[PDB]
Design a protein around this ligand. Structure first.
Ligand SMILES: [Cl-]
Ligand SMILES: [Cl-]
Ligand SMILES: [Cl-]
Ligand SMILES: [Cl-]
Ligand SMILES: [Cl-]
Ligand SMILES: [Cl-]
Ligand SMILES: [Cl-]
Ligand SMILES: [Cl-]
Ligand SMILES: [Cl-]
Ligand SMILES: [Cl-]
Ligand SMILES: [K+]
Ligand SMILES: [K+]
Ligand SMILES: [K+]
Ligand SMILES: [K+]
Ligand SMILES: [K+]
Ligand SMILES: [K+]
Lengths: 167, 171, 167, 164, 166, 164, 166, 167, 167, 171
């Protein structure tokens, strides 16, 4: 797995709160980042996961964590989806579009015969290092409060080396 | 260009008049086909081109010409666009999703740095041979009327190998 | 397709108005150019196509557009055809000879089994970027006025960056 | 990631509640399995993670789920650890030894600079398909409850496909 | 040089006596053939050469020698040359078009930087073997009677094998 | 064989009489060293070989000879073994751990199908040159006396070259 | 063909007028040169060809044309041919030996399965450019006066650049 | 090391008790073999080692063990040496000559920049498997009674699998 | 050297006693053969060498030995040389022409920079095995009687397997 | 053959008049050299050839010709052979050992399936150029007299480039 490796450079368009923006790896430097992958806009499993993250987003921002959802759809499609799902509408973090699949392949997370990203979540520290990975099949929902726990634990070990907190 | 070459095998999902289906090269055998590529759903020039084609779709079906629009969006996104745009809503032909890019790359039509198809139109005879190609830049829309002219010309030269259609068709 | 790519350097002899000239990519720089490819001189379809472009050539010149007709024949042949056909006789743009096929292959437009160019038209902006392509089968003629309409649209978006043009 | 791929053939020795058994992929056929990797026995860290799974093992078995812990240590070391740690002692699932690192590389889970497996958990269905993956850095703990929840979700969609 | 080698197969359109025909290697089998390459239709130097040859053509034919002129122009252009030039119009043999340059390259006779053939003449016995070659520069012209002497000579040695003729 | 070649750079953790130390090739410079490989800690075989060397360790040190035992186990496992086996407990030389197998492959001594080191002993002189090699199959025992004799012979020809 | 290309450097021993000399590309610079290849010394067909040429040699020289005959025999053998054959003995120009076959291969003129040159003649202007080529089979012989006409022609076009001569 | 690998085919001339003979791997099948390498005939370290083995040879033969000394000298040189050293004279086992170095390289035991074999001893069981290896520098003498011990131990484990005898 | 290797197949024209013949490896089979290589006909050293062999040729024939002289010259040249030189005139063995250099290169005896053979003699037994080689520098002549002595020795060891022949 | 080529660098040990020495290509520079290869010490044809050379060795030294015999045996074996054979005992020139084969392979003279040199003799001029080569089969001994003849011929053509030595030398 990619655990404990440094993330790779990327440049992508995103939709974020009514605005189109660009995102590169430089935007993640010095920050905690969550890269939240999912297969496709306008499907019926992803949104509750995405919505669950949206619910915890104010908390993540207070922890200094940025969230980037990623799929191989375009940022245009993201804006449309955001306009038409009540669940997606409550997303205020960056929805990155990855139509070239470069970001997705950076994380070794492409279904090559589908052109869609696997349902994988990556936690990345200020120095670019991946510290937690979660990948599930469709229907095995990713729980955002567990994600929150892992990040507080990651942040804690970063602040107290030599000491660690297990299960 | 790919003029006068046979199209490659493919297999993609599509949205068509309210349902999801598979389209392959076998579905085009013995038929006239139009592969109408565009960059992305929910953008700006595309709807006018696609709707203009839709307007001529009933006419085209009588020429036994099928239409397949293609972008690298999924068929799920096509369905949504069709349910939110009044223009897209009048499309009765198949909207193919090419998220892998394979269909687009078959027609050598990918902007590789963008992951989107160029605005290319390919006319394909019942034997699979590309008979007309049109490609425009991002801000240049295509005229569905001239498209029909080119299809009628093609079926003519097919119907009468002994002759020709010079500039500007008129039946 | 070659859409949105820059044209390759070339160097060719051409017949233009009673005289023989040289053409290179440097003549096309800072100009709008049409490269009008056709199969062979002294054949049965091309006269009308070339003749139509000629009918529009005055307006084309007014819009700063240069026209180059290309076949794999020589400029000697073009000169002869100009004399024999009253249609070809009205051409006042450059008729390029491409007997090495180099210029034709630059545009990837060779019928390798026949050594003749396919029926392709190429619109090239002042930066050498290809902005429109039309290619038809051997029995299908091209409409010069549809071409002109494309050029005007291309010139428009060049002149108004934020905007676009459908039909 | 290895999500949705089929596990590879393996053959390893293991310690399981008082004896040495061999474990192959054939043992996992028809069952739910958890492959739980960790870097090393006998460390200075309290092995709360293995014991945590041990605590939930009675349920796991009641769900038809088998558990295999895996490190690049030998099964000899596992027998030793099991006899000296009160926490490890309460493990009744099989502790696999992987000194060739083959089982670990099958799951693409080797820290190459260290010769130890990363903290990775793989949930494998009865057809041998990986349905869930979890990997964490040293110092971030895996929660056996969150694993139990995922397993039951994996079993539910197995039994009721396309139910949203 | 290609001297004493077999010719390679080919398939070309050609203008000859008003109508268009096809020429392949199968047409030269069992016959004497002259392949007469030149650079380009509608130029200055080539016509006298072809006309000189054409002058000797009816003689050649009674010797059982077919003539095939070749340039990289189309057979279409050849027909147009035939109607505009008093010289060329007196050609009764086949004017082969070689726009793909295949036939020309078969004889290793293509100026690759020009897409034109060099001024080369090949004499080919009925077995398909090249028995005489003449190549000159864009300035010098080929004398047809000299070709006729080289052909008769090539024929003697074949009909009288085991002898030689300077 | 590796006879008469120079040992390669290494860096390993080790257990040595109550503590964890790091050992590199720089520690062997200027000294006589014995690298004593074995396949695994905590086995069902009585480790007579390591103890046998332990018995002769006081002399070895008196000859300026250092001893390093090496297995593909971790130094954690070594600390464990040392605290549970009466025989191992009497070892006072460094027990190196080699879980990457790098040290072992340096001496070309890995059983690849097993991920364990073969029963090999290497005697290395102060310039880092291998002067004697011994390798035996499982079940054939190494004799610490025969090792002592070879070391003293290696030291003698070192001091009196070409004396026959 | 090699028509209109530059000749490649070479260094060969040669027999000429009783004494042995060396010939390199440096000797042809600034001059008209005829390279006259033949298969083998002491055979039947070659001598009349060389003798025919030799007949025209003093004429050639006043045109500033050097002649170099070439076969894959040694210059030693050339000298012996010169003493045994009445025909050959009247050769006043250079008989180059090419036993390594380098010079012959330079002109792409080696029958590789024989180690002999083909009957090829090359005309080379002072800039080292081949302006005329004639190759015939082991039966046909080359007419020297015809070579002389092809040379004078090649000279006119160079002295009157921008004109042509059939 | 070559421990526990199968020996490779070889064909070599040897001197053995006044007689020249051939030896191949087939001669070792079903037998215990010692391959005793040394650098060169007519030197002053090898013979006592070789002589020590000669002393124990009757014992080795009673154990069913064959002995092959090997060096890159020829079998002719062996016969000469045997005639002129009293120590070598008491050798009654096969002295293999390996002037091509093939046998020596089979055991990965060549000093390539010397063309001489290293001082290595290999113990090989009836099935071709190497069970003990000893390699020393010059002057660190190989002791034949230790060799004897190792062979009795090897033979013992072969006869009693599951049981083993350590140090 | 090529000593003790088998000769390669060849096919060459040769002058032998007023007539032109073909020689191949099949003519040498079941025979003893001398291949006498020399640089060039009509040069200044070879006459004596060839002449000497000729002096011994009668005895050579009596011993079942065939002689082939080889140079890169043609058989036409050999025929001419046979007429002009009273020395060469006394040769009654085959004078092979090797203008392709194929036969010369078979014996690895080409002066690549000169296209002439080196001065090498080769003795080939009835099985095609090369049993003796002599090669000298350009100014050094070969002794035909030393050659004859070699052939007799070679024929002897062929006839008496267990035995050998010094000087 | 290697005729008219320069010998390659080498470095070997040798036995020579009771002592062990190194020989390299540098030792041959400016000297006439004979490299006299034979298959193996303690065999049967070799001693006669080597002793025959020894008989001519004093003469050869006056021609400024050095001799190096070579086999793939060690120099230790040469010393022994020299101390046990009356024939070998009279050798005063250097007996080179080529156990690695490198010297032998320099002269392309190895029987690779045997690890022994063939019976080859190479004459080498002071500039390193091979001027005469003789190779015989296993049972054919070489004549040291004819060897001298060839060396005298070689020094002659060296001393007088303007001339030649035809068949059978006679000073
Ligand atoms: Cl991963
Ligand atoms: Cl295309
Ligand atoms: Cl294109
Ligand atoms: Cl994974
Ligand atoms: Cl040619
Ligand atoms: Cl080793
Ligand atoms: Cl040529
Ligand atoms: Cl080994
Ligand atoms: Cl040889
Ligand atoms: Cl040689
Ligand atoms: K997409
Ligand atoms: K053309
Ligand atoms: K291990
Ligand atoms: K390990
Ligand atoms: K020759
Ligand atoms: K040896």
């Amino acid at each position: 797995s990619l655990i404990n490796t440094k993330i790779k450079p990327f440049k992508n368009q995103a939709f974020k709160n009514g605005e189109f923006i660009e995102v590169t790896e430089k935007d993640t430097e010095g920050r905690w980042s969550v890269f939240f992958f999912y297969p496709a806009d306008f499907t019926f499993v992803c949104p509750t996961e995405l919505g669950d993250v949206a619910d915890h987003y104010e908390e993540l921002q207070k922890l200094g964590v940025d969230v980037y959802s990623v799929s191989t759809d375009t940022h245009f499609t993201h804006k449309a989806w955001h306009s038409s799902s009540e669940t997606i509408a409550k997303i205020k973090y960056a929805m990155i579009g990855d139509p070239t699949g470069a970001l997705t392949r950076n994380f070794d997370n492409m279904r090559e015969d589908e052109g869609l990203a696997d349902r994988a979540t990556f936690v990345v520290d200020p120095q670019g290092i991946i510290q937690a990975i979660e990948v599930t099949a469709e229907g095995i929902g990713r729980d955002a409060s567990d994600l929150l726990r892992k990040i507080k634990a990651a942040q804690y070990v970063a602040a107290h080396p030599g000491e660690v907190c297990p299960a």
